[PDB]
Amino acid sequence: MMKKIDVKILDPRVGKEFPLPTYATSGSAGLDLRACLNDAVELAPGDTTLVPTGLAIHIADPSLAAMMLPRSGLGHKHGIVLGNLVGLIDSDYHGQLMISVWNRGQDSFTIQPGERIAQMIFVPVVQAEFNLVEDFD
Amino acid sequence: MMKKIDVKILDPRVGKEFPLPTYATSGSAGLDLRACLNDAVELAPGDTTLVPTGLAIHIADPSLAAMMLPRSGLGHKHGIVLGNLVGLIDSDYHGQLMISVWNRGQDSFTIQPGERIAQMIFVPVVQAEFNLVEDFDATDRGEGGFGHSGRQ
Amino acid sequence: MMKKIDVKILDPRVGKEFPLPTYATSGSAGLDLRACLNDAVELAPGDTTLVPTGLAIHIADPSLAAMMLPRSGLGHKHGIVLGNLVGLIDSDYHGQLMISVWNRGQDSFTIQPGERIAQMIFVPVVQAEFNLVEDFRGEGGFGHSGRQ
Ligand SMILES: O=c1ccn([C@H]2C[C@H](O)[C@@H](COP(=O)(O)NP(=O)(O)OP(=O)(O)O)O2)c(=O)[nH]1
Ligand SMILES: O=c1ccn([C@H]2C[C@H](O)[C@@H](COP(=O)(O)NP(=O)(O)OP(=O)(O)O)O2)c(=O)[nH]1
Ligand SMILES: O=c1ccn([C@H]2C[C@H](O)[C@@H](COP(=O)(O)NP(=O)(O)OP(=O)(O)O)O2)c(=O)[nH]1
Ligand SMILES: [Mg+2]
Ligand SMILES: [Mg+2]
Ligand SMILES: [Mg+2]
């Protein structure tokens, strides 16, 4: 079940020094996002930093959304997760994709340029319309 | 894809003191949930508090569920997120929707009545039927997990 | 709506000492997962431990994934959540299902053999192929719509 998604490269290192995001294995649900940075960033325990990806997507189909998630190795082994926990990307967002990286653990961690620091899945979504009732029975 | 969902305005402040939940933009995936409180609540760093939404929904369709999530601005800038991280709402749950608000950050934060403090999406769900096997049809990923594909 | 998932039992207690995961009601979205431990694990505030389930699943269909989540009661009342926040099980994984348990709260907590410590849903997923373009809410994000 494939879907074409338009993407605009904002930093010319993307697609060259920093490969475009890809699925690590053929049945992976998420694609890995890379940190678009000149220099490594040291995250002390408790600190948050906003990491640019250097690209923008336009999902455009209002029956689809994306969810940014931590990776399980970074999250479990190093406490490197997301500051907003889960990042919900709307179908009508055109801006640069940004990653809120938060050190939830006890050890300092150093994010390298180009590192695969989070992942992103695409999921069908349903828009609800409310039917106001006085009681459900 | 639009679906009509029954909702009971369990707390009549919702729709009167502050607006009913709606989709912030046309192409928004989630709808914002508001703090149904009589008094402001100051959350010190590390603290949690249980905030009512004033709403009960009945999805009723077992092929659908809802998920409650933090908002990205409150979460990234102020460390205001969920105490259970992600809230899962069953299709046959029709009690009040409650929000566990947790201050994961280093500065205190005051939740005001009516404030949009989290968001909710509706997603399709599949119910699994387990088939016991002796061997798997092996794959390239195999048993690999927890960072086996590397950092770079 | 329903999908057949291959499962292998790795610990003989699973299905004998305590049940295999089951949907509690016909309208339940998730299945509860039980800690398959020999000895209870003490978790100080801020600690993380990796908890086996005694089970391996193989979803096998690349338009489907599973998401592991905290339970709302354990999360809100005791701060017992997931160390990777949300656990994403891929269609081509067939290792042991493992739960990263993190004590995010201010009080110690002990993970007990057999305790229902997390839950898991299965959701459809779509794999994307990129189309490079020069030009395409607008660009508004991270709070732009306000809170009032
Ligand atoms: O909570 C979890 C998360 C993942 N897993 C396993 C199954 C999943 O398919 C595999 C990899 O998941 P992620 O891709 O989300 N994490 P990461 O990218 O760090 O690992 P990998 O390098 O193997 O892809 O780890 C668990 O058993 N429990
Ligand atoms: O953030 C939440 C999460 C759940 N809920 C409601 C809806 C859901 O259907 C119900 C049960 O969710 P969980 O299974 O996550 N909680 P728990 O397992 O602790 O309680 P139960 O024993 O009733 O399943 O609680 C909320 O109001 N807010
Ligand atoms: O991790 C994220 C989350 C969101 N975003 C962008 C895309 C999304 O469409 C937009 C808004 O997301 P939320 O609605 O979850 N956050 P918030 O409600 O604070 O911002 P807004 O007022 O713009 O809706 O922000 C990111 O770039 N990274
Ligand atoms: Mg991975
Ligand atoms: Mg928003
Ligand atoms: Mg439950």
Numbering used by the authors:
A (entry chain C): 1 to 137
B (entry chain B): 1 to 152
C (entry chain A): 1 to 136, 141 to 152
Publication passage describing the model:
Among these, dUTPase and uracil DNA glycosylase enzymes are responsible for keeping DNA uracil-free. The enzyme dUTPase is tightly connected to this pathway, as dUMP is the sole precursor of de novo deoxythymidine triphosphate (dTTP) biosynthesis. For the protein dUTPase, there are numerous high-resolution dUTPase crystal structures deposited in the Protein Data Bank (PDB) (reviewed eg. in). These structures all show the well-conserved dUTPase jelly-roll fold; however, there are some structural variations. Here we show that E. coli dUTPase and protein Stl form a strong protein complex associated with nanomolar dissociation constant.
However, we could successfully locate one specific position (EcDUTQ93) where mutation of the glutamine side-chain either into histidine or arginine led to strong inhibition of dUTPase activity by Stl. The two resulting mutant constructs (EcDUTQ93H and EcDUTQ93R) were both clearly inhibited by Stl and the inhibition resulted in a decrease of the steady-state velocity by 58% and 47%, respectively. Based on these data we observe that mutation of the 93rd glutamine position into either arginine or histidine increases the strength of interaction by approximately two-three fold. Therefore, we crystallized the EcDUTQ93H dUTPase mutant in the presence of the non-hydrolysable substrate analogue dUPNPP and compared its structure to the already deposited wild-type E. coli dUTPase structures. A novelty of our structure is that the whole C-terminal arm of the enzyme is visible in one of the subunits, whereas major parts of the segment are also visible in the other two subunits. This part of the enzyme has central role in catalysis, however it was so far missing from all existing E. coli dUTPase structures, even if they were crystallized in the presence of a substrate analogue. Our crystal structure provides a strong implication for existing interactions among the histidine point mutation at the 93rd position and the C-terminal arm of the enzyme, serving with a straightforward explanation for increased visibility of the C-terminal arm section. We hypothesized that the increased sensitivity of the EcDUTQ93H and EcDUTQ93R mutants for inhibition by protein Stl and their stronger Stl binding ability compared to the wild-type E. coli dUTPase is in connection with the restricted conformational freedom of the C-terminal arm of the enzyme. Data from the quenching experiments clearly argue that solvent accessibility of the tryptophan residue in the EcDUTQ93H,F145W dUTPase – dUPNPP complex is decreased as compared to the complex formed with EcDUTF145W. We therefore conclude that the quenching experiments in the solution state provide re-enforcement for the restricted conformational flexibility of the C-terminus observed in the crystal structure.
